[PDB]
Write a protein that binds this ligand. Structure first.
Ligand SMILES: *[C@@H]1O[C@H](CO)[C@@H](O[C@@H]2O[C@H](CO)[C@@H](O)[C@H](O)[C@H]2NC(C)=O)[C@H](O)[C@H]1NC(C)=O
Ligand SMILES: *[C@@H]1O[C@H](CO)[C@@H](O[C@@H]2O[C@H](CO)[C@@H](O)[C@H](O)[C@H]2NC(C)=O)[C@H](O)[C@H]1NC(C)=O
Lengths: 250, 250
């Protein structure tokens, strides 16, 4: 297999993350059974590493699903760390990584051995090794739920320094989230196209792939807007380049 | 008891934080038994809620003790969240909360029932209810170790907008960390007096309590320097005040 082996101590981490997240939930929905949640997730670890479908995680979702505050959803592509850092544990925004069912698996890997019953810590199938592996099918199901339950102002953070452009036509955002947005409960979609400090400006609002994304969103009838290097996030990026002309203060 | 009662699901959170932190440790010091570490921590939990001494966590420390990179220690007072956020999980600096024995207990509470084998999820003694309570004794032992294991350039983040002064003369830094610094392996000490955006300038370098701190450190033979609103941290504060004049970019 051509992808990371399952994460060491998967269960403790999962349960730990789940416990800490409960505290964030409001009491009226704080009653989440982390053990039951782990057992529903655990199902994919009993199947063939190439025979897991997004629907296998349905129970998991039912047991961990909770509401996402209006105008608090934050989608993204090629900016994982900047998103978690900026969102700051649900304080600023609530991206998938900061929603119960996403928090428990963020950055982790998992899959069962090809022929044995135990977990494969050596490697796990990549989308290329086979389409229906545990990790991809997981995110597809989680990405779908996240989009469906998002409302208000939809924020999206894309990478303008990414060599393949800011919008991957075949990413999770394009194939599993955009098609699941409830236009009925979405006011407008705002995009933040970020560039590395000094780093390359491969694409800015309205250029290359950004035209394709913008066109799709507008055809689907969404109110659309795009901002290059949205200030708050730029300031966070700047923390690591305090002495760079782009980061100098008045 | 007047302080917060023990954290719900304390064991799962503990083991989860411990397992996750293991990945951040050097392969040489990656051999950490979380379960064993927990059992050691529990040795203080089985005692009377007002009869726990720092020495009770000696075993805990022993089994979780790991080295701290040179020049990466970051001490502080009245700026817990700003430090955790700036340290960015051992990426920039490694504060007590980003060291194994600190990470497993950051923000949590714990204590045995006044008179019963179970944990008291109702309330835990504060420093007033009694001095030798589980939580305060914990941080004393942890602070002493963190201090003893620090080296190179020592950094300290203080809140210059703190009504009672930047340097608490009766806090953990003053009573349990400064006394334990190893001058022999310390090059210099640098202070960062931070102020809230716009917030009050109660004290700055060379004023009030700062005069006391500087004089104490100089009397001990350390090289000293103090910076007002250290830039990188300022930028991080600015993330939440992007439009404020103190945060305008050039
Ligand atoms: C935005 O995309 C760029 C380009 O892919 C990322 O920067 C690269 O990151 C890799 C892995 O750390 C490095 O090997 C390259 O040297 C980087 N290139 C450049 C030009 O910096 C960047 O990390 C992405 N930004 C975020 C927030 O994810
Ligand atoms: C620095 O100290 C100030 C003053 O104690 C802190 O700000 C106060 O925090 C309390 C508790 O949340 C608020 O109710 C007050 O409104 C705040 N006042 C002011 C003037 O800010 C501040 O949180 C501290 N900064 C850090 C980073 O810990």
């Amino acid at each position: 297999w051509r992808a990371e082996g399952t994460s060491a101590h998967l269960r403790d981490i999962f349960l730990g993350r789940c416990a800490e997240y409960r505290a964030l939930l409001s009491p009226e929905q704080r009653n989440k059974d982390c053990t039951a949640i782990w057992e529903a997730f655990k199902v994919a670890l009993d199947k063939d590493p190439c025979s897991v479908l997004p629907s296998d995680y349905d129970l998991f979702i039912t047991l961990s699903r909770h509401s996402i505050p209006r105008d608090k959803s934050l989608f993204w592509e090629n900016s994982h760390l900047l998103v978690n850092s900026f969102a700051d544990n649900t304080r600023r925004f609530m991206p998938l990584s900061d929603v119960l069912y996403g928090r428990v698996a963020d950055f982790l890997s998992w899959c069962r051995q090809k022929a044995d019953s135990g977990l494969d810590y050596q490697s796990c199938p990549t989308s290329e090794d086979c389409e229906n592996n545990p990790v991809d099918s997981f995110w597809k199901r989680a990405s779908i739920q996240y989009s469906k339950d998002s409302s208000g102002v939809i924020h999206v953070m894309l990478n303008g320094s990414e060599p393949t452009g800011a919008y991957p036509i075949k990413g999770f955002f394009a194939d599993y989230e955009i098609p699941n947005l409830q236009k009925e409960k979405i006011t407008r979609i705002e995009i933040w196209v970020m560039h590395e400090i000094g780093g390359p400006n491969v694409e800015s609002c309205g250029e290359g792939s950004m035209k394709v994304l913008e066109k799709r969103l507008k055809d689907m009838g969404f109110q659309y807007s795009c901002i290059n290097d949205y200030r708050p996030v730029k300031l966070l990026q700047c923390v690591d380049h305090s002495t760079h002309p782009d980061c100098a203060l008045k």
